[PDB]
Ligand binder design. Structure first.
Ligand code: CA
Ligand code: CA
Length: 87
């Protein structure tokens, strides 16, 4: 239901954040991507983004947490699209 190619696209997306390729997205890395996107999250915001999806509380987001976020975002999106369909 999440599909191989999607997890592969998620891994690839993950590496856009996990820039040192260390397997985790750290608030720095998120912050760096966020800023490259012209956003300017605060550490608190970044930390909080990391924190919401940091299932294991180790302070960074590893691929499985990332995938879970993305998977659920994907679910949520589909579910919102469905609701939009009904709206
Ligand atoms: Ca990293
Ligand atoms: Ca983690």
């Amino acid at each position: 239901q999440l599909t191989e190619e999607q997890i592969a696209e998620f891994k690839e997306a993950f590496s856009l954040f996990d820039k040192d390729g260390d397997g985790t997205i750290t608030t720095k890395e998120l912050g760096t991507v966020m800023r490259s996107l012209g956003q300017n999250p605060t550490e608190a915001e970044l930390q909080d983004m990391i924190n919401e999806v940091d299932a294991d509380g180790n302070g960074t987001i590893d691929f499985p947490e990332f995938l879970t976020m993305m998977a659920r975002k994907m679910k949520d999106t589909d579910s919102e699209e469905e609701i939009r369909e009904a709206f």
